[PDB]
Design a protein around this ligand. Structure first.
Ligand code: FES
Lengths: 47, 151
């Protein structure tokens, strides 16, 4: 896995897995996007 | 109500001021153009990170750009919070608690309880949640419909 739930989970207590995410948009999505930008050598704006 | 770049000696002095006073939900103006964000564009803060003072810490939804963009503290001038419109009459600075009727809050209890009283810090970008500082847990996220003003 590219990201760890404990690190990116946005709840007031960490979810035990991304499948349990309680946010409207899953916390793993934005995490993967920011991880892919870093892997491409881009900054947060894709620059 | 907020200071501007001209009130400080150095860029880093001003950036520290912006950092201590900015919150999600605030309106800002671009006071120094940066890439896709032109000077004088107006934005609503939608996300704040806390990396180095010169990092891209401030994500806004920008009116003239027509989309989101990350900037640094030095690029923004704080304007203020929008007026209460949630119809909850909860506003920034109010004391709130979780409703007695809530068994488990949407984003979980953390260290908070039904007896906790916290201070509203920000309205979340999604228009449904608030960020609350409780004595037992800072940056606690609540669903507005689960929270109420403390009598
Ligand atoms: S993973 Fe916990 S709220 Fe999203």
């Amino acid at each position: 896995d590219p990201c760890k739930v404990e690190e990116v989970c946005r709840a007031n207590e960490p979810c035990t897995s991304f499948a349990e995410c309680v946010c409207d948009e899953n916390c793993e999505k934005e995490a993967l996007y920011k991880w892919l930008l870093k892997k491409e050598g881009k900054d947060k704006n894709g620059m | 109500t907020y200071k501007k770049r001209a009130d400080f000696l150095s860029n880093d002095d001003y950036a520290v001021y912006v950092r201590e006073n900015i919150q999600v939900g605030m309106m800002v103006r671009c006071c120094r153009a940066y890439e896709e964000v032109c000077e004088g564009d107006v934005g609503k803060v939608i996300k704040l990170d806390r990396d180095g003072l010169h990092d891209l810490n401030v994500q806004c939804d920008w009116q003239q750009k027509g989309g989101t963009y990350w900037v640094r503290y030095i690029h923004v001038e704080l304007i203020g919070y929008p007026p209460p419109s949630s119809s909850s009459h909860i506003k920034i600075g109010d004391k709130v608690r979780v409703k007695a009727s809530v068994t488990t809050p949407k984003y979980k209890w953390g260290s908070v309880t039904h007896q906790s009283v916290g201070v509203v810090k920000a309205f979340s970008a999604n228009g449904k949640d608030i960020i609350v500082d409780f004595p037992q847990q800072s940056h606690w996220t609540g669903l507005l419909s689960e929270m109420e003003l403390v009598p």
